[PDB]
From Swiss-Prot:
The keyword Transcription regulation does not apply. Disulfide bonds join C34-C123, C178-C249. Residues 7-279 form the Peptidase S8 domain. The keyword Disulfide bond applies. GO terms for biological process: proteolysis. The gene is PROK. Keywords: Calcium, Disulfide bond, Hydrolase, Metal-binding, Protease, Serine protease, Signal, Zymogen. It comes from the Eukaryota. It comes from Parengyodontium album. The chain holds residues 106 to 384 of 384 of the full protein. Its EC number is 3.4.21.64. Belongs to the peptidase S8 family. Ca(2+) 1 binds at P175, V177, D200. Binds 2 calcium ions per subunit. This is Proteinase K.
């Protein structure tokens, strides 16, 4: 399949080179997989989700995404126009409030929730969790992310937007999950992207067009935007049978574009998520 005039990030993950505009992908499109978006919620009614999104848990008064952040990230995972895995099932877990903030205790509960809830869901091609969130180092938060991964979920987390070593941020610094840095459309490390030995992979993160609340769209930037590219890619590859929840981060690193990025500090991987789709 081919989506013409795609968002640059989608085009980038299906090219060995920057500057293209078509997103090439296998038509299976993550069908049969499930991605939990652990965030401010998902506006499931957005036409871009085509009925494939639903809220399954909220830690606040409402399940509504009153911010937009979670809806944007979910759109990059699996919306029709803005998504990597255009036929995946999306599950919203609202651990962040409508200002985009959340307590670590709540974020941990949300992770524990997904590890259990997946056993109530039909996800024959596997389960992914996208965590576009984080704060300062916490062993408890890291442990929650490690548990979620261990339970059989492909966990992708944001490296953080501090232009610093991700070792000091959580869940970014948890080694066993997939820690995602951000790049821009000219293959530079995004100006804000964290770096460091704990990063597994980079994904498109600067000026990313996706869904927003009120049935709208907008472009925003962050390692929050790179993370769902990798989560969606994982879902897509799992549907194709190329990898599993336990091994996808490593598979994505194996098969990434190598050495394409600039301003990568020595000791940080120079790896950019790539679907290696060959028609
Ligand atoms: Ca290249
Ligand atoms: Ca890792």
């Amino acid at each position: 399949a081919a989506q013409t005039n795609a968002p640059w990030g989608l085009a980038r993950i299906s090219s060995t080179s920057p500057g293209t505009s078509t997103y090439y992908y296998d038509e299976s499109a993550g069908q049969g997989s499930c991605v939990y978006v652990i965030d401010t919620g998902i506006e499931a009614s957005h036409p871009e989700f085509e009925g494939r999104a639903q809220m399954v848990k909220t830690y606040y008064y409402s399940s509504r995404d009153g911010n937009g952040h979670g809806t944007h990230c979910a759109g990059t995972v699996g919306s029709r126009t803005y998504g990597v895995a255009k036929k995946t099932q999306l599950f919203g877990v609202k651990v962040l409030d409508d200002n985009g903030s959340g307590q670590y205790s709540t974020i941990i509960a949300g992770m524990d929730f997904v590890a259990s809830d997946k056993n109530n869901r039909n996800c024959p091609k596997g389960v992914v969790a996208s965590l576009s969130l984080g704060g300062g180092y916490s062993s408890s938060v890291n442990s929650a992310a490690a548990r979620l991964q261990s339970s059989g979920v492909m966990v992708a987390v944001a490296a953080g937007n501090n232009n610093a070593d991700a070792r000091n941020y959580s869940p970014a610094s948890e080694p066993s999950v997939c820690t995602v840095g951000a790049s821009d459309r000219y293959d530079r490390r995004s100006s804000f992207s964290n770096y460091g030995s704990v990063l597994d992979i980079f994904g498109p993160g600067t000026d990313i067009l996706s869904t927003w609340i009120g049935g709208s769209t907008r472009s925003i930037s962050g390692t929050s935007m790179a993370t769902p590219h990798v989560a969606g890619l994982a879902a897509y590859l799992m549907t194709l049978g190329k990898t599993t929840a336990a091994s996808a981060c490593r598979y994505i690193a194996d098969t990434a574009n190598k050495g394409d990025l600039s301003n990568i500090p020595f000791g940080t991987v120079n790896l950019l998520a790539y679907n290696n789709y060959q028609a």
